[PDB]
């Protein structure tokens, strides 16, 4: 059902993060080159961002589809107004693009998430302090926050992973973590329904919990490597499980077997494919791997 159509080969070192535009046929790819590139659909990039220093780790798109937030090694966050599609890649540089700059925790930003309330966003770092931001009001949490994300059904509840092996849920207006649920935990995601929340363990066991009692409802072994990234369908049917086995799998939220398996990526080091991203309007799937090779299947 999903065949390879594009290989966005213009990044040198590993592409850590990637995310699809909501409506446009445009894909944003952040790498360790300290630079990220926007592409519009053997294809060439449409824009490159010359504002971030140090390798980029995490990226999020403004749900309206006009701004992008990034945070990586530089321990800072950048906020650009992405130029619309059909712009010239070889055009006059516009300094206004980097409209926003966020200075927060002194450590590298490992996790970035946008909020559907269009005024806040979650930034977790290696500092151990998750920060909620408003594009200048920041609410911090001093609980190894590997992954921290924004539950969609209620923007009040948010999740937080940990290198321990558990993940804690908390609120927005309370800052009081509700319950933990159960070793490195690479990537956590939240279903577009309130209860279901998916986590990926270092022990290669994709696990599932609920935002009300954190029950270990399901723990299926996924691949032969620590599952690095997870991506959720914009309508909650399938699930991309990117693993260090250079083997991405489309699981089904009902049938938790190998509903589909694609394997195209190189083991450049002990680390393999970083991130996986669905679309939301055009049904494309993109995978950003360790060798800086964004594959796109339609």
């Amino acid at each position: 059902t999903w065949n390879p159509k594009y290989t966005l080969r213009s990044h040198f070192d590993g592409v850590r993060a990637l995310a699809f535009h909501p409506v446009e046929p445009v894909l944003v790819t952040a790498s360790e080159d300290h630079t990220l590139k926007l592409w519009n659909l053997d294809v060439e990039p449409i824009y490159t961002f010359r504002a971030h220093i140090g390798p980029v780790l995490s990226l999020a798109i403004s749900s309206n589809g006009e701004q992008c937030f990034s945070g990586g090694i530089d321990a800072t966050i950048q906020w650009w107004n992405m130029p619309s599609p059909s712009v010239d890649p070889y055009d006059t540089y516009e300094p206004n693009v980097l409209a926003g700059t966020l200075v927060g925790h002194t450590d590298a930003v490992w996790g970035l998430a946008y909020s559907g309330i269009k005024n806040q966003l979650l930034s977790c770092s290696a500092d151990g302090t998750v920060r909620l931001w408003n594009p200048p009001c920041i609410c911090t949490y001093n609980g190894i926050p590997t992954s921290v994300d924004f539950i969609g059904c209620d923007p009040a509840h948010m999740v937080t992973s940990f290198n321990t092996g558990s993940a804690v849920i908390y609120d927005l207006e309370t800052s009081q973590s509700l319950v933990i649920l159960s070793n490195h935990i690479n990537r956590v995601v939240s279903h577009p329904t309130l209860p279901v929340t998916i986590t990926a363990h270092e022990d290669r066991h994709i696990k599932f919990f609920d935002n009300k009692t954190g029950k270990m409802i399901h723990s299926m072994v996924a691949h032969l490597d620590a599952v690095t990234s997870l991506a959720v369908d914009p309508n909650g049917i399938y699930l991309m499980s990117g693993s260090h086995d250079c083997s991405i799998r489309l699981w089904n939220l009902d049938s938790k077997t190998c509903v589909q398996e694609i394997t195209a990526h190189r083991k450049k080091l002990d680390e393999s494919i970083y991130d996986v991203a669905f679309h939301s309007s055009k049904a494309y799937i993109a995978s950003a791997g360790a060798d800086a090779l964004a594959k796109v299947f339609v």
Partner: protein, 33 residues
């Protein structure tokens, strides 16, 4: 039959979109309280 099922698909799309609007409104209502 192909054309008929295509129109059925359009119908289901309308239904899903109006479902989206309804659920967004209910979420906003519950969030207000």
């Amino acid at each position: 039959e192909r054309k008929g099922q295509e129109n059925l698909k359009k119908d289901l799309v309308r239904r899903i979109k109006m479902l989206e609007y309804a659920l967004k409104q209910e979420r906003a209502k519950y969030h207000k309280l």
